[model samples]
Target: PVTFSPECSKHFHRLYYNTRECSTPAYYKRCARLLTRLAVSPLCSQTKLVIWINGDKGYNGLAEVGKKFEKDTGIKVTVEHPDKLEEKFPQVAATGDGPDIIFWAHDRFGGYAQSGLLAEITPAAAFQDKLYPFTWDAVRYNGKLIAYPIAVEALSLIYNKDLLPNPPKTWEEIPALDKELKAKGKSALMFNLQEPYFTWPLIAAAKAGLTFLVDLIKNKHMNADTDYSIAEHAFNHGETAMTINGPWAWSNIDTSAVNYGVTVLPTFKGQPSKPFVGVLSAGINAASPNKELAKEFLENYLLTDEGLEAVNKDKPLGAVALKSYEEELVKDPRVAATMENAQKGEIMPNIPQMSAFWYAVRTAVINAA
Candidate 1:
């Protein structure tokens, strides 16, 4: 197996810091020059690696990033869009037949890691420190790091500015807001009642709060039958004042005529509403022969500012995980809401055992309704 010599490793470490000084284009060129200098050894030149990306638009951006890496290092990188990846990845990986790397939500990796289908990896401290702290929790399973985090998603208060003007500052204020909205023929809030991901803030924060929400249902101020799409559609049509949702709804919401703004969930009982944070991540296949090359590509190329820019060009995929982009990210109100909410959110439990919670939560919610 080819490996970085001590001097080569030292040079690579130095390049990371030097990148801060140079322009983006110049930095990539310099790194390419350094890699070419090492080509005399059996470096990763002319190697072919396959990776799976889930979304069509995300795949295009990944394809561009891959194209640049292949152009720079003479390594061929292929990006594939797979179907039903969460269900199929394990079946294919167990047979030692799958892409070298696969992209998915961090929670989806737990089963893969537990089944020995994912390669355990330790990302460099330098790279890890550049990301948000919650990202690390997303990539870890049973105390071992299993993936590289790329983006984040969490529930927040998305309000129609035309209807509400200003969002409620606290859960206690919602009743008055609801009354005011009711007079205006709108509801103060709406969220998917069945999905635990959306309802977690109420259930986990306070049983009293849950009862408060049920009162809304009883008064017909909030609809118990409203699911994700129903809430999204109503909010976009200006039929509702606010919706508890994530960044995924921003694009569709933007296309509508309603004026909207996103903010952190209102305070409840003197504390910020805690949403469940979900991370988009990529993991190497445990059985792939190109794990080393895959690791290098992910750490050096994909996680960089240039790489993330490509992935988010078509659409912002939630809040990016890198702290380096926080200032710029907040410029987009929707992305800013995600970043703010993530600070007060809990990382979704990435464990096989979480299946029980999903099942139980659904039934509990149904019975309550």
Candidate 2:
């Protein structure tokens, strides 16, 4: 069903090898041997694996995973890093000449599965007990497994410890503190309007009756007719003492001057603020010529311990899907809260209507602010 031109396959293989590099000689030897086996293995004989990566960083990670996949299963993997992937995914999929596997987040999962763009994974008997419940739960759509989840992105509330004796337990208390700080000519929160990711928590706090754009439209709550200029203007000045964000913001935070503490976004009435969980996963193309081989490669390499370590090199910001990695990741103070929050977090909905909700939420934020 999925077809790739010989020309595309050749170019993809070159890109695949160019982006993957082993960190150690032992790793190299092992990976090389793995690739060699796959190259000649009956399971992978003539099948070519192609992966579409959304972000460049994901491309790098996939490259490493691809190498390991080849080594372990004798499957050949090729990757394509298309510019403006969101805009390009539809056209690529329509042609049925796209990647054999797609590396994506949950936001796109719902729609793709519903539309049959994604292939369902019939859970094997072994899979029942092998994965964490949260991770496995995230991959299910209409009672069928749509994709295999690799990693997650968790969000938390970050505050400067030196300034406050203790973290505030509710959103209601934050505004009063902001007013107190403003009177003293000090910022209550450090934020950037240019980045909406930073405001996810605030929007959640407002309970603005919005969940991406679709909810905004369906509810007819606040729309583009409203003025959100104040919210944008305020964030630009960085007047808040605390804000919501993920690990990527670590570099921008000034830890040297401020003793910062991180915690899960506080809940109201026992309901926690659930931010979008960014999951990296692999989906097979239904029309793949080498579907059986590609599926085998995914089952062997992606779920393997070696494959997990290869992708989570620096243990970036949160606990990986593997239980062993959780112990090490939680020891780092910066990531501790994130790990806890992830356990309680909800998997972002992957339905196709996600686009409308994503934009509608953004529009609501601007108008409401």
lDDT of each: 0.79, 0.60
lDDT of 2 by residue, 39-150 (tens): 5554433446888766433355557877766665555678787766655665676576677877766567777778777788765867545556677777788988888766
Q: Residue 303 in candidate 2 has what lDDT?
A: 56
Across residues 1-369, which tens digit of lDDT does each residue of candidate 1 receive?
223335555655665666653347656777677656655544423466788877533677788888887777666788888777767788898775688899887877898899999999978888889998768977888899999988887888989998888888888788778888888778788888868778877666657767767777887778778887788888889988989987656767778978888897988777888877878888999988778888888888888888888877755677888878655777887887788898787888788767676778777776777
Name every residue pair that clashes in candidate 1: none
Lowest-sum lDDT 10-residue window in model 2 = 219-228
TM-score winner: 1
As for model 2, its CA RMSD to the true structure in angstroms is 12.0
Per-candidate RMSD vs. true structure? Answer: 12.2, 12.0
Cα error of candidate 2 at position 152, Å: 3.4
For model 1, the stretches where C-alpha displacement exceeds 4 angstroms are 1-60, 67-84, 96-99, 331-333
Q: Which regions of candidate 2 fall more than 4 Å away from where they truly are?
A: 1-48, 56-58, 71-76, 79-84, 160-167, 176-186, 190-243, 248-261, 266-271, 314-317, 331-335, 343-345
TM-score of each: 0.76, 0.65
